[PDB]
Amino acid sequence: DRIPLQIVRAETELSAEEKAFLNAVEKGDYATVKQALQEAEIYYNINCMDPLGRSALLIAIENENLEIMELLLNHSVYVGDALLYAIRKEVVGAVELLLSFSEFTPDITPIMLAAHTNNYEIIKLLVQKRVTIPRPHQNCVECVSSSEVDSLRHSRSRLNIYKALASPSLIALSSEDPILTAFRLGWELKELSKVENEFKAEYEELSQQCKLFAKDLLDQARSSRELEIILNHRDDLAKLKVAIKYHQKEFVAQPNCQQLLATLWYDGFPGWHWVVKLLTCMTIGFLFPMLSIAYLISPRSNLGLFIKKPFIKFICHTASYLTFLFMLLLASQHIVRTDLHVQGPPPTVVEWMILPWVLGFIWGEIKEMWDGGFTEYIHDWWNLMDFAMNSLYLATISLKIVAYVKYNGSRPREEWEMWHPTLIAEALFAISNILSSLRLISLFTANSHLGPLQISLGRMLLDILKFLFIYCLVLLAFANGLNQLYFYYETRAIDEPNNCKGIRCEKQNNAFSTLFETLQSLFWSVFGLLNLYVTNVKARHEFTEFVGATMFGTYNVISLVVLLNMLIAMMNNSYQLIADHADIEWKFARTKLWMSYFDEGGTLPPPFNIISLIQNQHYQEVIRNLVKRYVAAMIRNSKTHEGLTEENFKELKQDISSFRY
């Protein structure tokens, strides 16, 4: 009825004299400790540990007392890890004095611990002693052997090294240019989280730390000349392009960089109501062909130089695409019309006028791909869409020529086979029209209202496919079951009214007769477009019809009462996390869009497209001042927590006592 309590693992008991010694050391009594040390020296332990494991030097370090610390250091030995304990507490005097069971993993070195503490003064003190830190590897024989010998130690050592390397103080102190080092280190740490799945959080935190350090270093500029020097440094805005390559979104979206980019973008438009802006945009767009011919004839003329402005060039490109879409509208109305019975018809007028635009788009896309390379082309999701639409256009053009060559006579439409080339050409043309009209979504990024919504929608598309996978699995299961049940009662087309078979008839029938038809029927029941009498059978077998109706009802419940609402909930959760960063991502996308019109390579719109020492010296001077303000800034920003002035006041009393004796 009682539980005894005993000490299962007991340490060596300390003697009474040692206990008094340790109590005197903790109490900070110099006289008693000095007398105890003297009587121990002349009578004969100095290196005893308390149950917590702290030797007398450790308590001296923890008590922030220098006098008895020197007292033991003069008489005692076995410093051990006292330097690490002094560094962790961030005491400058004790660390300097030391330079002049363990709580730490054995691979820790003083420099890496100082980097971990992110103390600039201690790091600077240690660096002057010619210390060095190993460079971690990226897959050799040694790496493999160490992994087999001890995986835990290997991973922990790598993590410790990478935490030491990612300290802002170390980068600010021992790097030629901290901005490029921060960019590269952040990218490398980001790539490491995808390989080391177990420790992903730590690596993402380190990469975020590097990005924040780079942005904060950029934040210290005080004049426009310094900003230009930093942004234009080359090892054209080379630094901005390097930041874009490394996905430095916080760095790029800084207000000063955005102001400079907006100044470059709205050149020739000083002080850019919205109605006046709309009128100016429409007026410039209406005159795009004349500007294009003016640029073609003579770039030296003022009219030729007029299109070189990025904003006017963007307006001209948008106007050209809008003209192409409008002329696509004309074809859909079939103003010219066709006999409909010509098996191969010559192209109408509208098709001839359309033809140059398609060739210009193909030329632009192929030139872009050739210049960028395969990898850059694969990186852009919009480029894939352009490739698909251009392939569809090419297929339509080839099929029209094939149909014209193959056939010479005329025939009524109702007699042609289903795979006639003309029908495929028309279907592909319609699909290409639909795809071409949807390309205007990529222009929403230039608007302050529409652009954030476009970015957020793009960010949430990953999870929708994740749900469509589960929906496809459930649909396949239920389609298999229903087709297995209902395939014994297939009828013929001639046995139905109007000779129509399937669910696209006036009266739906044969809904679950074939697997393809079962999939089509189950797809359309999501929108309530499948009627309920399709579960009936001509033979009137009530058990089979009841089972089929129950299967259909179970599918309806699962698909509409459960999965749709879970999709709603997950979309709600994902959007909230995404919303906190919408502005930064939108501005990153917008500055990506702006920079594509800065070059002079593609000035012509698509229809007409067919016809060094002193730099480094200045960069170092600005970097020397940016780092100086950074270390000053975050110390004062860390003074929101500095109430230790009174403890220093006690140090003043101690200095007065030292002057006294």
Binding site: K124, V127, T132
Partner: peptide, 8 residues
């Protein structure tokens, strides 16, 4: 390995 350096 990389050697750290600071760049009466």
């Amino acid at each position: 390995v990389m050697a750290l350096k600071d760049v009466l």
